[PDB]
Short mmCIF file of C-alpha atoms in Angstrom, two decimals:
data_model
loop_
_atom_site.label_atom_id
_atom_site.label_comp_id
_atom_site.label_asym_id
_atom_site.label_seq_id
_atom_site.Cartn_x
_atom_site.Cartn_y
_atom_site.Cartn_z
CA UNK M 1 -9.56 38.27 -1.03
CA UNK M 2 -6.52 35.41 -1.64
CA UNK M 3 -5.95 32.36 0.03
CA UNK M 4 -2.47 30.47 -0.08
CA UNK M 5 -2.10 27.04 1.41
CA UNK M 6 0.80 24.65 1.04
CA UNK M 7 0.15 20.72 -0.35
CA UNK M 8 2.15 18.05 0.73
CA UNK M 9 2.46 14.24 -0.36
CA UNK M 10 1.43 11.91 2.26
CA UNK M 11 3.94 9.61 1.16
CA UNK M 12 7.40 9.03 -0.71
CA UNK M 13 5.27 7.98 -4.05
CA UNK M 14 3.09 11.43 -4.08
CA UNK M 15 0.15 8.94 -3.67
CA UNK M 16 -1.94 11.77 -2.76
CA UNK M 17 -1.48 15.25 -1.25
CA UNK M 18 -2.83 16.93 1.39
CA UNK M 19 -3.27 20.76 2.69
CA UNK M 20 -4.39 22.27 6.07
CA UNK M 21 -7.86 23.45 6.66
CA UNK M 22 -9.06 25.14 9.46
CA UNK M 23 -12.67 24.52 10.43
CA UNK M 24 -14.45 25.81 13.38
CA UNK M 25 -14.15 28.14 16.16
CA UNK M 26 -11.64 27.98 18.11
CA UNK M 27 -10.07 26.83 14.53
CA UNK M 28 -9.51 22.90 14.50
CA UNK M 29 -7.15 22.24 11.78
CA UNK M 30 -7.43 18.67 9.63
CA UNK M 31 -5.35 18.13 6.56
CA UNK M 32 -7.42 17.55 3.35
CA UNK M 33 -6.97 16.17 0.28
CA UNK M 34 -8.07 18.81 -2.62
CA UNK M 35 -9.99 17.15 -5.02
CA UNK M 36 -11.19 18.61 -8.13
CA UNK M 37 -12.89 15.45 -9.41
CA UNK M 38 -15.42 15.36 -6.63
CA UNK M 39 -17.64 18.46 -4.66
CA UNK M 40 -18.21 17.36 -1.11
CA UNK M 41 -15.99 18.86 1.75
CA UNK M 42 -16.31 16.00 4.00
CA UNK M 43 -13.93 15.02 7.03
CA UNK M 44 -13.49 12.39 9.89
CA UNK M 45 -15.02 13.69 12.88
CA UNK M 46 -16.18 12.72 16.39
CA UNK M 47 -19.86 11.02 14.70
CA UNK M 48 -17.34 8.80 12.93
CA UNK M 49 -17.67 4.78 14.19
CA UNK M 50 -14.64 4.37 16.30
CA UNK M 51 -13.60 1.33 14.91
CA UNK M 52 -13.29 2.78 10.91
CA UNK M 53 -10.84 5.81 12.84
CA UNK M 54 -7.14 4.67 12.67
CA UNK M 55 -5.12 7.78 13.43
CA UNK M 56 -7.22 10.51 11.45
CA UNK M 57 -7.56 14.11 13.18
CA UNK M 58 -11.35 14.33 13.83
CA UNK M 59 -13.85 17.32 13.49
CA UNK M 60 -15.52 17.92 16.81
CA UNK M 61 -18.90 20.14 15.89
CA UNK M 62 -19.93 19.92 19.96
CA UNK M 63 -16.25 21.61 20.33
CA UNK M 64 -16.92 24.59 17.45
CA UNK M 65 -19.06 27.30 18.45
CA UNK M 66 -19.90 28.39 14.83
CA UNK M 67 -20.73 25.21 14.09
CA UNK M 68 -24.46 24.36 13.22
CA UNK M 69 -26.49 20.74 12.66
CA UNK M 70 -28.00 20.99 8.80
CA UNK M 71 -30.91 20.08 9.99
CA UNK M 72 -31.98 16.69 7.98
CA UNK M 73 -29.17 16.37 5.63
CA UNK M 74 -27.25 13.64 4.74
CA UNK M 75 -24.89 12.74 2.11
CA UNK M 76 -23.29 9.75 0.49
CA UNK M 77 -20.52 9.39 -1.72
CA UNK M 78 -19.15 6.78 -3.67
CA UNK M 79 -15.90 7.01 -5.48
CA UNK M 80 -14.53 5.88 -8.44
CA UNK M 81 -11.77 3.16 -6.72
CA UNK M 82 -14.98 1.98 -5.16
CA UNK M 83 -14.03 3.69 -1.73
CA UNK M 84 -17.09 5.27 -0.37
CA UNK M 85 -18.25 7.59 3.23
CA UNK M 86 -21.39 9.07 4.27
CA UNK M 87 -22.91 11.02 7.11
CA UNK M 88 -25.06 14.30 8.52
CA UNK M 89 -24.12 17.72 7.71
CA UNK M 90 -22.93 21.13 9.58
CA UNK M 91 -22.47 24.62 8.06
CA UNK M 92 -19.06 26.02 9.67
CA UNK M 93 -16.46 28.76 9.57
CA UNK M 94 -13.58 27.13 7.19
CA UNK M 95 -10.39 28.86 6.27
CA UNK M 96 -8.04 27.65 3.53
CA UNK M 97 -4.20 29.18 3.47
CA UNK M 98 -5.68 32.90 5.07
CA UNK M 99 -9.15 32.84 2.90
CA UNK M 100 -12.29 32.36 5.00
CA UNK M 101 -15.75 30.87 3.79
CA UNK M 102 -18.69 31.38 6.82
CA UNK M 103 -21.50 28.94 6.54
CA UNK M 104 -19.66 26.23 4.72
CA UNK M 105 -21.16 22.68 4.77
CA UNK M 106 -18.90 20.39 6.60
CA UNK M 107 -19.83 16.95 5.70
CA UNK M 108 -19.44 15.19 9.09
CA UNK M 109 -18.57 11.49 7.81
CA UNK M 110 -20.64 8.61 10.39
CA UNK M 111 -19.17 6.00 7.96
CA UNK M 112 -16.06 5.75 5.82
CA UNK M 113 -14.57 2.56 3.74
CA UNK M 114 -11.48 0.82 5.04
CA UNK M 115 -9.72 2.33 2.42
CA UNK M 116 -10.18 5.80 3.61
CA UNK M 117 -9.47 4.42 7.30
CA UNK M 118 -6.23 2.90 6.20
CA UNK M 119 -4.72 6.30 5.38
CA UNK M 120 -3.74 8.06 8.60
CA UNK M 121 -2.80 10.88 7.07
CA UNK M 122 -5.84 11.63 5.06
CA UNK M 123 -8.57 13.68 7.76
CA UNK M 124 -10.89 14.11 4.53
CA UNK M 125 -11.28 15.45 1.32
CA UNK M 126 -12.27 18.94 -0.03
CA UNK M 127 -14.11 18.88 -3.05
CA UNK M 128 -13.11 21.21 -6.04
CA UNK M 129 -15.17 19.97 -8.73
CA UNK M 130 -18.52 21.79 -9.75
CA UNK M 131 -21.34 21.97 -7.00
CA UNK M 132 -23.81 20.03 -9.32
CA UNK M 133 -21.95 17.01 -8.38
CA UNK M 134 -22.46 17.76 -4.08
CA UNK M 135 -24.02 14.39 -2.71
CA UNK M 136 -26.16 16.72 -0.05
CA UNK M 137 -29.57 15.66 0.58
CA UNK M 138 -32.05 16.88 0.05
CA UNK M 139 -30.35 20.29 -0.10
CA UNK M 140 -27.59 19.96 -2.69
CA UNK M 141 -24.94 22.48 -0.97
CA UNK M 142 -21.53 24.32 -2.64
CA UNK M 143 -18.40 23.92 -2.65
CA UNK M 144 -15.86 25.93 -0.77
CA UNK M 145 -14.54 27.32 -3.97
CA UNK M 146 -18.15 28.12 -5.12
CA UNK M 147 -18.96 29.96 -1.98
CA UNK M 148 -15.69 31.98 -2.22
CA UNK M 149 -15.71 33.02 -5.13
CA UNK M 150 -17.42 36.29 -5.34
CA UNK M 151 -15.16 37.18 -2.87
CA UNK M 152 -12.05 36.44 -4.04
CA UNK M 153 -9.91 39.03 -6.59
CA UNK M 154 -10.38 37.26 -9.39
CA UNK M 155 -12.71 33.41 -9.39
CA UNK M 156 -9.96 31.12 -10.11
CA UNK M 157 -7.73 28.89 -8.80
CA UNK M 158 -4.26 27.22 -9.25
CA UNK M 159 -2.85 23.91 -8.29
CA UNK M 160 0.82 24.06 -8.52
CA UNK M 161 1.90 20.28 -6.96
CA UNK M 162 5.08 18.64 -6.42
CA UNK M 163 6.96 15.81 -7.22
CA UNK M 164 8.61 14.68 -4.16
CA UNK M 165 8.10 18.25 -2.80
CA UNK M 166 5.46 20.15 -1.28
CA UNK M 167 3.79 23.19 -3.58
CA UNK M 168 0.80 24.71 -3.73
CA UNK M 169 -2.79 26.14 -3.94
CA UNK M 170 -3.71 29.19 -4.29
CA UNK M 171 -7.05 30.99 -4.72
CA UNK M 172 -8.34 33.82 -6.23
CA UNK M 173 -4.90 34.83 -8.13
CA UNK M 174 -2.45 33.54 -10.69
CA UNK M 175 1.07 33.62 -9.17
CA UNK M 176 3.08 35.01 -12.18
CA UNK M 177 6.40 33.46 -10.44
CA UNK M 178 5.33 30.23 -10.43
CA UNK M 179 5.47 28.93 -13.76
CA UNK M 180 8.12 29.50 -17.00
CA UNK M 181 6.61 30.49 -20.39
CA UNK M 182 3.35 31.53 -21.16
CA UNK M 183 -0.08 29.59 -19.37
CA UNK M 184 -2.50 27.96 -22.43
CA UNK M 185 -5.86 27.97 -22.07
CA UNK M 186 -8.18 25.45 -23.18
CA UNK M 187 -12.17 25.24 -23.01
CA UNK M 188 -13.90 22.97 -20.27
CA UNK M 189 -17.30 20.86 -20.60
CA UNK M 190 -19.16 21.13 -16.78
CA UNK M 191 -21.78 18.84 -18.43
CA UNK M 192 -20.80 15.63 -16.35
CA UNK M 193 -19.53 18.18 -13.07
CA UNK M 194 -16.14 18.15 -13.90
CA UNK M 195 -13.13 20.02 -15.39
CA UNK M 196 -13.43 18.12 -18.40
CA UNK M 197 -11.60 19.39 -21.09
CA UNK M 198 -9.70 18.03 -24.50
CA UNK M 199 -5.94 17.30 -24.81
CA UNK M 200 -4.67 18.03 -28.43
CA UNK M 201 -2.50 15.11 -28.35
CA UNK M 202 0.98 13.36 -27.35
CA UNK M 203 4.37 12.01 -27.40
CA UNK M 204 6.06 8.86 -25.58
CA UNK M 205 10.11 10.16 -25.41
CA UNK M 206 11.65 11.87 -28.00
CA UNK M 207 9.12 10.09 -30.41
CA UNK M 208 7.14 12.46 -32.73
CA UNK M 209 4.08 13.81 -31.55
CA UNK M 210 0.25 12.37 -31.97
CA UNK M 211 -1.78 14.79 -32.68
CA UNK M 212 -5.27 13.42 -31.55
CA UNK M 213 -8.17 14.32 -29.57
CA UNK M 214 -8.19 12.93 -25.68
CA UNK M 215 -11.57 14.12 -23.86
CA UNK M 216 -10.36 13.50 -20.24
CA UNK M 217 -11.02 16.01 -16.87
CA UNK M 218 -8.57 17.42 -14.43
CA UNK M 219 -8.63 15.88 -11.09
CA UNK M 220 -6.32 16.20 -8.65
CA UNK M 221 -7.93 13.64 -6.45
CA UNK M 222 -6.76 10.72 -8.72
CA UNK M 223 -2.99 9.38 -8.31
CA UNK M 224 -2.09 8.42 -11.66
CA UNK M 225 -2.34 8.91 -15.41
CA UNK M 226 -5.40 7.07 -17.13
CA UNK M 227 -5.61 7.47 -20.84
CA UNK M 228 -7.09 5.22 -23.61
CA UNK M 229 -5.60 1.94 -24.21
CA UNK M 230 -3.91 2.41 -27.56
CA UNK M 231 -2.01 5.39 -26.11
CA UNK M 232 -0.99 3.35 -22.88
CA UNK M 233 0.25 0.62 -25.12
CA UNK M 234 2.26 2.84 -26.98
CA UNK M 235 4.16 4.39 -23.93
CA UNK M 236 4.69 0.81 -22.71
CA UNK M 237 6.12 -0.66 -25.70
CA UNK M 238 8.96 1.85 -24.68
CA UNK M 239 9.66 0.26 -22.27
CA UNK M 240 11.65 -3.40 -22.39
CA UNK M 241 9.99 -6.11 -19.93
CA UNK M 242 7.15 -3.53 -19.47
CA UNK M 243 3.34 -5.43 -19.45
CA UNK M 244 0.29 -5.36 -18.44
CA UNK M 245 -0.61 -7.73 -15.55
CA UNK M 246 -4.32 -8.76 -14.45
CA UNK M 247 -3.18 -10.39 -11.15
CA UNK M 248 -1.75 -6.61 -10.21
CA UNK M 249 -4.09 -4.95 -12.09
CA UNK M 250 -2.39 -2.52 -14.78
CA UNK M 251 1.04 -2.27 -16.45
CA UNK M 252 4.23 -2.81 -14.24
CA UNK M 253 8.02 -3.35 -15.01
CA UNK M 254 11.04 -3.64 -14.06
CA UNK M 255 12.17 -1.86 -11.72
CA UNK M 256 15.71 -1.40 -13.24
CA UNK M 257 14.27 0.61 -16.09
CA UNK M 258 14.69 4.20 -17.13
CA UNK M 259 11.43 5.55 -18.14
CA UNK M 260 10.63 7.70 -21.10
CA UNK M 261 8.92 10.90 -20.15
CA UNK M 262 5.18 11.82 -21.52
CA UNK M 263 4.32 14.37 -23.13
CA UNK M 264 0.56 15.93 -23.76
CA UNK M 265 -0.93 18.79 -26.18
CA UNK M 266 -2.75 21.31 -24.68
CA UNK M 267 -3.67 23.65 -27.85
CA UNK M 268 -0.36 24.08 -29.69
CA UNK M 269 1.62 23.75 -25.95
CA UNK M 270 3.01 20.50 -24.43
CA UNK M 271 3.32 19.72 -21.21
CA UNK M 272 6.19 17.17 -20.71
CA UNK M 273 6.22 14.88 -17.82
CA UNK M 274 9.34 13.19 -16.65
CA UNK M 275 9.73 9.60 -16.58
CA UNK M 276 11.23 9.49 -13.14
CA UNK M 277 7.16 10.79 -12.69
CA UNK M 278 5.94 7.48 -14.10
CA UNK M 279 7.35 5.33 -11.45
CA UNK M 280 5.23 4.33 -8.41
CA UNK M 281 7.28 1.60 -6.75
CA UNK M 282 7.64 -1.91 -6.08
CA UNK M 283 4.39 -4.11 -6.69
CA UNK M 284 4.85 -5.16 -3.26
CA UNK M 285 7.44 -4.39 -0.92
CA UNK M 286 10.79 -5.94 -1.79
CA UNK M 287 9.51 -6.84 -5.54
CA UNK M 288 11.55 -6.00 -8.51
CA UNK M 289 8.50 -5.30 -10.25
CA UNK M 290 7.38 -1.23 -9.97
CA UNK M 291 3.88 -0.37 -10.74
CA UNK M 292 3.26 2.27 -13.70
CA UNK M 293 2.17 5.58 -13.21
CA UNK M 294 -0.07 5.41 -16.76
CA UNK M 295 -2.66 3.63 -16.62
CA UNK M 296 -5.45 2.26 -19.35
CA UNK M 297 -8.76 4.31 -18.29
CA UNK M 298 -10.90 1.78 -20.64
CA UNK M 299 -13.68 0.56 -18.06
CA UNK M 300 -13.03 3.61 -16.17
CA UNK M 301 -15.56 5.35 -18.76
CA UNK M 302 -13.33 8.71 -18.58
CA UNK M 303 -9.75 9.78 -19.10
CA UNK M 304 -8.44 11.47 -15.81
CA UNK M 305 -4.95 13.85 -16.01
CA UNK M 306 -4.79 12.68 -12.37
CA UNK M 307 -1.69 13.73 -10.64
CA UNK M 308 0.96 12.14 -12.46
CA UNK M 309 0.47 14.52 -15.16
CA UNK M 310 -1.22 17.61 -12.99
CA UNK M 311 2.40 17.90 -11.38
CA UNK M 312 4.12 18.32 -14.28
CA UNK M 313 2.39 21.87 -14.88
CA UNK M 314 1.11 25.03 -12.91
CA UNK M 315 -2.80 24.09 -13.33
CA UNK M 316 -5.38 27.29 -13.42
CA UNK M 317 -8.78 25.74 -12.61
CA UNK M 318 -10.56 29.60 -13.88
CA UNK M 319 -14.20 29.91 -12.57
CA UNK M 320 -15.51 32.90 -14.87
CA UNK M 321 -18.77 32.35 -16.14
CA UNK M 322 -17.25 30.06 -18.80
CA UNK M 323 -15.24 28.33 -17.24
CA UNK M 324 -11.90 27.41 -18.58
CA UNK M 325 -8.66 25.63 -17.39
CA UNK M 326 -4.82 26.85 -18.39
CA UNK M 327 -2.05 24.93 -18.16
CA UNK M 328 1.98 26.34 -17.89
CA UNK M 329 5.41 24.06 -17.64
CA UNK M 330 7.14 25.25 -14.50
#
């Protein structure tokens, strides 16, 4: 089996993406944001306090009748912005762009930060990650990934996401039209749950490349950029009135700039992103300060290729036995 879904950014910044999920029967369909730095499917449904729902789709279980109660689980997650939800659990029918999982835990959320209820457009997440990192208790459950997989043609799949433009996942093939050149391939650590893998290197501009060794994982779930501080700072001195500002919390500048694009090693590839991908806006609405899309991760405790770069390239996340992840320009 395949499954083909469309991703769209909520927003005119490509703060985050999301892609249609049916869930239930009749099918109720919510629009998820894939995230392959975290493993719980979890969603805003009718359990939800009213007061933490602001315009979110809900799940109703009572409405669904595959749905089933997971009888004593629970599950609690806690993310690394410091948002956080948490709730019971049903197994469900749940169908991603044509492909269908049955018995897939739903993680029906009873509580959800403000952060999560301040995005309307955002009905829940779908974790991509691996399942050692599902919050379910005290019956750790999979992924929808993990429980497709034996089905699908071949146990991978691609995120192909836009800038300023929809694109796509797909599962279970590699779509052979969707990226230029050849795709690299590049080992991946599971050891902390994620696609954790090592960039070769980089470049700020038309500057000569870096080579050096940046452990970091692949998660579309995360907006920007974060890479270690010396490499930030180098990218930033490019850039004249750029700094880095405690009050706003990370480098901003000025919003009359042209950026310099980014580019990053995966084995003897590059992936180049383009500068106009760097820019995330006025500080505040209005301000002539724009907030950058790279980002120190020191105090994070991990690099993350979050979006900002992830867009730049067709992304295989390949789930073979040893798992491995490829990256192509497009």
């Amino acid at each position: 089996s395949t499954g083909s879904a469309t991703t769209t950014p909520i927003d005119s910044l490509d703060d985050a993406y999301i892609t249609p999920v049916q869930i239930g029967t009749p099918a109720q369909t919510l629009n998820l944001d894939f995230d392959t730095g975290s493993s719980d499917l979890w969603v805003f449904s009718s359990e939800t306090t009213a007061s933490e729902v602001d315009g979110q789709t809900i799940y109703t279980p009572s409405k669904s009748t595959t749905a089933k109660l997971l009888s004593g689980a629970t599950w609690s997650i806690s993310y690394g912005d410091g948002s956080s939800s948490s709730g019971d659990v049903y197994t469900d029918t749940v169908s991603v762009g044509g492909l269908t999982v049955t018995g897939q835990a739903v993680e029906s959320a009873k509580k959800v930060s403000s952060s999560f209820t301040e995005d309307s457009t955002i009905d829940g997440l779908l974790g991509l990650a691996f399942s050692t990192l599902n919050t379910v208790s005290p019956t750790q459950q999979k992924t929808f990934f993990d429980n497709a997989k034996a089905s699908l043609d071949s146990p991978v799949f691609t995120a192909d996401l836009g800038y300023h433009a929809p694109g796509t996942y797909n599962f279970g093939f590699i779509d052979t039209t969707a990226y230029t050149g050849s795709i690299t391939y590049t080992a991946v650590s599971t050891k902390q749950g994620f696609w954790e893998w090592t960039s070769t290197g980089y470049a700020v501009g038309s500057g000569t490349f870096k080579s050096t060794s940046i452990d970091g994982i692949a998660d579309t779930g995360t907006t920007l950029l974060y890479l270690p501080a010396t490499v930030v700072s180098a990218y930033w001195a490019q850039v004249s009135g750029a700094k880095s500002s405690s009050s706003v919390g990370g480098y901003v500048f000025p919003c009359s700039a042209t950026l310099p694009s980014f580019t990053f090693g995966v084995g003897s590839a590059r992936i180049v992103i383009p500068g106009d991908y760097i820019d995330f806006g006025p500080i505040s609405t209005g301000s002539s300060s724009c907030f950058g899309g790279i980002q120190s991760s020191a105090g994070i405790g991990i690099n993350i290729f979050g979006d900002v770069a992830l867009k730049a390239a067709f992304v295989v996340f390949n789930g073979a036995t040893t798992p491995t992840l490829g990256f192509a320009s497009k």
